[PDB]
Design an enzyme around this catalytic site. Sequence first.
Site, PDB file in Angstrom:
ATOM      1  N   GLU A   1     -59.409  27.819 -25.255  1.00 53.97           N
ATOM      2  CA  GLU A   1     -58.726  28.789 -25.825  1.00 53.97           C
ATOM      3  C   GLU A   1     -57.166  28.542 -25.953  1.00 53.97           C
ATOM      4  O   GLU A   1     -56.669  27.767 -25.291  1.00 53.97           O
ATOM      5  CB  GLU A   1     -58.611  30.053 -24.796  1.00 53.97           C
ATOM      6  CG  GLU A   1     -58.086  31.510 -25.128  1.00 53.97           C
ATOM      7  CD  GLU A   1     -58.477  32.362 -24.184  1.00 53.97           C
ATOM      8  OE1 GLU A   1     -59.509  32.416 -23.638  1.00 53.97           O
ATOM      9  OE2 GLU A   1     -57.299  33.160 -23.709  1.00 53.97           O
TER      10      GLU A   1
ATOM     11  N   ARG B   1     -52.448  38.216  -2.607  1.00 60.64           N
ATOM     12  CA  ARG B   1     -53.409  38.943  -1.540  1.00 60.64           C
ATOM     13  C   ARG B   1     -53.498  38.276  -0.275  1.00 60.64           C
ATOM     14  O   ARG B   1     -53.295  37.144  -0.164  1.00 60.64           O
ATOM     15  CB  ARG B   1     -54.793  39.124  -2.183  1.00 60.64           C
ATOM     16  CG  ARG B   1     -55.033  39.816  -3.232  1.00 60.64           C
ATOM     17  CD  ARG B   1     -56.368  40.015  -3.315  1.00 60.64           C
ATOM     18  NE  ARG B   1     -56.706  40.641  -4.773  1.00 60.64           N
ATOM     19  CZ  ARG B   1     -57.752  40.324  -5.569  1.00 60.64           C
ATOM     20  NH1 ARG B   1     -58.567  39.425  -5.497  1.00 60.64           N
ATOM     21  NH2 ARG B   1     -57.856  41.045  -6.765  1.00 60.64           N
TER      22      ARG B   1
ATOM     23  N   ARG C   1     -57.568  27.939 -20.777  1.00 64.09           N
ATOM     24  CA  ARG C   1     -58.742  28.054 -19.781  1.00 64.09           C
ATOM     25  C   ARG C   1     -60.058  27.601 -20.520  1.00 64.09           C
ATOM     26  O   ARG C   1     -60.120  27.611 -21.757  1.00 64.09           O
ATOM     27  CB  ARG C   1     -58.996  29.614 -19.403  1.00 64.09           C
ATOM     28  CG  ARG C   1     -58.871  30.565 -20.296  1.00 64.09           C
ATOM     29  CD  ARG C   1     -58.719  31.999 -19.787  1.00 64.09           C
ATOM     30  NE  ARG C   1     -58.727  32.977 -20.683  1.00 64.09           N
ATOM     31  CZ  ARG C   1     -58.549  34.172 -20.857  1.00 64.09           C
ATOM     32  NH1 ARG C   1     -58.157  34.526 -19.500  1.00 64.09           N
ATOM     33  NH2 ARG C   1     -58.158  34.872 -21.609  1.00 64.09           N
TER      34      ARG C   1
ATOM     35  N   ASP D   1     -57.925  47.825 -23.335  1.00 68.17           N
ATOM     36  CA  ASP D   1     -59.215  47.246 -22.713  1.00 68.17           C
ATOM     37  C   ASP D   1     -60.159  48.492 -23.250  1.00 68.17           C
ATOM     38  O   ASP D   1     -59.849  49.380 -23.636  1.00 68.17           O
ATOM     39  CB  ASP D   1     -59.048  47.422 -21.326  1.00 68.17           C
ATOM     40  CG  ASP D   1     -58.490  46.103 -20.478  1.00 68.17           C
ATOM     41  OD1 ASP D   1     -58.621  44.868 -21.301  1.00 68.17           O
ATOM     42  OD2 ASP D   1     -58.021  46.346 -19.567  1.00 68.17           O
TER      43      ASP D   1
ATOM     44  N   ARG E   1     -49.871  38.096 -31.298  1.00 69.08           N
ATOM     45  CA  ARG E   1     -50.371  36.839 -30.758  1.00 69.08           C
ATOM     46  C   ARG E   1     -51.775  36.935 -31.320  1.00 69.08           C
ATOM     47  O   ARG E   1     -52.593  37.756 -31.277  1.00 69.08           O
ATOM     48  CB  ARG E   1     -50.100  37.006 -29.374  1.00 69.08           C
ATOM     49  CG  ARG E   1     -49.516  35.663 -28.735  1.00 69.08           C
ATOM     50  CD  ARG E   1     -50.201  35.188 -27.506  1.00 69.08           C
ATOM     51  NE  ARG E   1     -49.924  36.279 -26.421  1.00 69.08           N
ATOM     52  CZ  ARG E   1     -50.732  36.398 -25.555  1.00 69.08           C
ATOM     53  NH1 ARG E   1     -51.989  35.508 -25.559  1.00 69.08           N
ATOM     54  NH2 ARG E   1     -50.758  37.155 -24.485  1.00 69.08           N
TER      55      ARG E   1
ATOM     56  N   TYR F   1     -52.379  46.959 -27.045  1.00 72.91           N
ATOM     57  CA  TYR F   1     -53.754  46.336 -26.452  1.00 72.91           C
ATOM     58  C   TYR F   1     -54.149  47.223 -25.819  1.00 72.91           C
ATOM     59  O   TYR F   1     -53.436  48.117 -24.918  1.00 72.91           O
ATOM     60  CB  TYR F   1     -53.297  45.014 -25.541  1.00 72.91           C
ATOM     61  CG  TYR F   1     -54.602  44.676 -24.997  1.00 72.91           C
ATOM     62  CD1 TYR F   1     -55.377  43.828 -25.833  1.00 72.91           C
ATOM     63  CD2 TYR F   1     -54.761  44.861 -23.673  1.00 72.91           C
ATOM     64  CE1 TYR F   1     -56.742  43.550 -25.082  1.00 72.91           C
ATOM     65  CE2 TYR F   1     -55.931  44.616 -23.113  1.00 72.91           C
ATOM     66  CZ  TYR F   1     -57.023  43.790 -23.904  1.00 72.91           C
ATOM     67  OH  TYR F   1     -58.190  43.375 -23.382  1.00 72.91           O
TER      68      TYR F   1
ATOM     69  N   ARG G   1     -45.528  43.497  -9.845  1.00 72.87           N
ATOM     70  CA  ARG G   1     -46.057  43.632  -8.423  1.00 72.87           C
ATOM     71  C   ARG G   1     -46.513  41.891  -8.012  1.00 72.87           C
ATOM     72  O   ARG G   1     -46.457  41.150  -8.539  1.00 72.87           O
ATOM     73  CB  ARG G   1     -47.305  44.182  -8.414  1.00 72.87           C
ATOM     74  CG  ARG G   1     -48.610  43.887  -9.277  1.00 72.87           C
ATOM     75  CD  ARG G   1     -49.502  44.856  -8.835  1.00 72.87           C
ATOM     76  NE  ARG G   1     -50.864  44.189  -9.545  1.00 72.87           N
ATOM     77  CZ  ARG G   1     -52.058  44.849  -9.658  1.00 72.87           C
ATOM     78  NH1 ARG G   1     -52.133  45.981  -9.009  1.00 72.87           N
ATOM     79  NH2 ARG G   1     -53.139  44.046 -10.280  1.00 72.87           N
TER      80      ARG G   1
END
Lengths: 386, 386
Positions: free
Chosen positions: A312, A179, A287, A365, A256, A363, A175
Amino acid sequence: SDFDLIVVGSGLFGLTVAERAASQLGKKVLIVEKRSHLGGNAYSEAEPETGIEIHKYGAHLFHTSNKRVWDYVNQFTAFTGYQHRVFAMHNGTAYQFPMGLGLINQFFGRYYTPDEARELIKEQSAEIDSKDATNLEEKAISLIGRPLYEAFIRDYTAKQWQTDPKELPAGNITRLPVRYNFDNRYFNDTYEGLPVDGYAQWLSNMADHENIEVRLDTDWFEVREDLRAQNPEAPVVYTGPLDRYFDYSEGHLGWRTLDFETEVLNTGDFQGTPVMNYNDAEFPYTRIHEFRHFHPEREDRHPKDKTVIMKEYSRFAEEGDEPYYPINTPSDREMLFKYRELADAETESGKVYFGGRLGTYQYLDMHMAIASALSMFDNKLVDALK
Amino acid sequence: SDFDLIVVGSGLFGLTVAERAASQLGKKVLIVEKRSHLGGNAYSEAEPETGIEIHKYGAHLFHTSNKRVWDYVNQFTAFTGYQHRVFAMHNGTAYQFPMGLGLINQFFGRYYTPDEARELIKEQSAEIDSKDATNLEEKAISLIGRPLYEAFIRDYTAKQWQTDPKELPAGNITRLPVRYNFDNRYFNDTYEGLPVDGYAQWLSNMADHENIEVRLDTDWFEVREDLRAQNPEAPVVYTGPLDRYFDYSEGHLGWRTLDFETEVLNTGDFQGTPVMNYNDAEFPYTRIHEFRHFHPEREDRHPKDKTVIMKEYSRFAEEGDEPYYPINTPSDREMLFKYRELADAETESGKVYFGGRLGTYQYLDMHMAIASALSMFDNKLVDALK
Ligand SMILES: Cc1cc2nc3c(=O)[nH]c(=O)nc-3n(C[C@H](O)[C@H](O)[C@H](O)COP(=O)(O)OP(=O)(O)OC[C@H]3O[C@@H](n4cnc5c(N)ncnc54)[C@H](O)[C@@H]3O)c2cc1C
Ligand SMILES: Cc1cc2nc3c(=O)[nH]c(=O)nc-3n(C[C@H](O)[C@H](O)[C@H](O)COP(=O)(O)OP(=O)(O)OC[C@H]3O[C@@H](n4cnc5c(N)ncnc54)[C@H](O)[C@@H]3O)c2cc1C
Ligand code: NA
Ligand code: NA
Ligand code: NA
Ligand code: NA
């Protein structure tokens, strides 16, 4: 019997199953956990020097549009009104992020209205049709154009996957990542926040029940023959590694991992925000997290002149490394299909159910693991425990 | 009797007094309101073409750290989780606002760390010591320096007050208007939000009580002899203009007013954010409000291709103009002191209490008006109604 149900692993999936069996069915549940603490990678702890709540297995941000899951977790902890926001460091400037009117103004040099920005993106992305994109790089360019892609997506993605984006699937972007307003909420979900007293307290509370027994520092494969012999007809919910369960009979699933470098610095504020992405190749880390800013309501308990930050680094998960994200090469999808067959056979012959991130090679959440456990409980375990 | 208490004016101050007397003391309250609706300037309404909730007497944002007031208002309406954020248009760029690491990066051209920004502000503000500032301009410069002052404060303030900042009091700025992090919450208060069903519903709910009578389209000074004659010993809480009450016997108190220019535009999104300040002199208005963005949770009830915006112009309040902000010249402070004496005499001889923004010549936010009314109720009216 001493237990009616065995749950292997105390991540959100395991905890949810255990708590539901305990409180809804009045069953005795034995949780077996290999680590020294409850909660899987969601577990957090106080950094010793500063007292600041930190994570050793990835920063955890809670968000969901699933009201059932929201109402459920609120039985076990209250949540702050934390709203995640991220900034993106590129060529010495911190950009508003995700891509929106703010970044667009900063990057292209003047204010674009919503409609002007739409037209700008149309112009920029004209070169490639999304229908023709053959890889991630082309897919990105087909949506937002080369300047934006090259500034904010290319090198970051390269670091994230240790792969040239030309060699990543076009299906990795699905997508428009732009914004057309000034909204810089990172997440799009109805409910969001952080546990008021930290993750360790929340997750401990889930397992705090008269019907729940917890054995930490215990590997299922060391103790399983003994435990099941105590009560053979007690089912098992297994949330450990799927391939390891079957002795890697079909090979090793690919994951990973992440290396986290944590530092205590002698300033009270390193970057003025919880997370700064480093989008440029010259920085090896993707980051920096500055953990104190996740809990600003605790600022007078935080030290005035110290702060904990974390860098990281991503790479392939080798033996000994914590497996975090499934790689999902076609080969991986191949042996996964074979492991699913073995697992389903094991559920039928041995009353061992497979769930969670490691147990299903997916994975998940926190809210998705909880939702998945609620489903398994409702649709499988209620019947199996009768 | 038909009423035990008369309240003149149905702003937040009047409504609060009326509701407390009604619900806490079981007193019959008559509210007299000059306008056609309840709520004073907080009143909002649907714009006819679009249905979007708008304000004709200023946009109203609710925020407070007073938990008593927060708990009180929540008896009458639920609040959304709206968090006010503002952007500042300067020389064709929309800046993050208030001044903080975001604006500083955008304006000075590269990222400054919290500590680097502190040092930058020290350097910039070196020229003038705050202790020596003789007016607003010098005060601002003494804190943040000339470049920032000239870009974001000078012309905006000039438009706001119709006055050169050299002629405004140094006391108008009392603290450093800079944050050394990326926090761009406009307000600093514990609680914040907007009424879920709009201001009109909330304020109507406050006056919706079996003990409350409401007479709209009614000017106190036309009806007061008649009303008091019905029950002479019923006290009056007056929240109309203080000087007008005493027939301007000591002169006219000075107020600032605002002209609001409202437009319905043929786009679904004009600026992608609720409020854009226009900091440059070339634009006559101080800011543009785009009302639909105050209630994003209503987006599928809002039109897809229309939006309502409003431009704001400040000037001196002349006869017929709605008085909004007290000017507070020394002359104004002079006659105010004289009106306070008259008012206090009137409270003693006539049981008329003076409160609210107009009644006391003091700008009051909603939570401050409510707090002030709760105090008057507790400390004056409970005794007066026994
Ligand atoms: C780096 C990282 C960052 C993340 N960030 C977020 C985020 O921001 N927001 C969000 O909602 N989710 C996040 N997640 C996902 C989150 O941790 C989920 O709660 C988790 O994926 C839920 O699945 P789980 O309970 O099956 O997994 P796990 O958390 O992995 O729990 C599995 C448990 O099983 C135990 N176990 C394994 N083998 C054995 C054995 N042989 N015997 C006994 N015990 C065993 C493990 O020690 C572990 O405690 C993140 C995950 C990672 C890895
Ligand atoms: C332009 C503007 C913007 C504002 N924005 C905010 C904001 O963002 N957030 C916030 O918390 N607050 C805001 N406020 C303040 C807010 O409106 C407060 O609720 C108000 O100041 C409360 O004081 P009040 O009830 O005494 O005043 P008012 O709202 O002025 O109510 C007084 C009422 O008395 C009536 N009245 C006057 N004379 C007579 C008479 N002779 N007879 C009968 N009735 C009479 C008036 O018609 C009026 O309805 C704003 C105010 C203005 C003017
Ligand atoms: Na995370
Ligand atoms: Na395209
Ligand atoms: Na306002
Ligand atoms: Na100075």
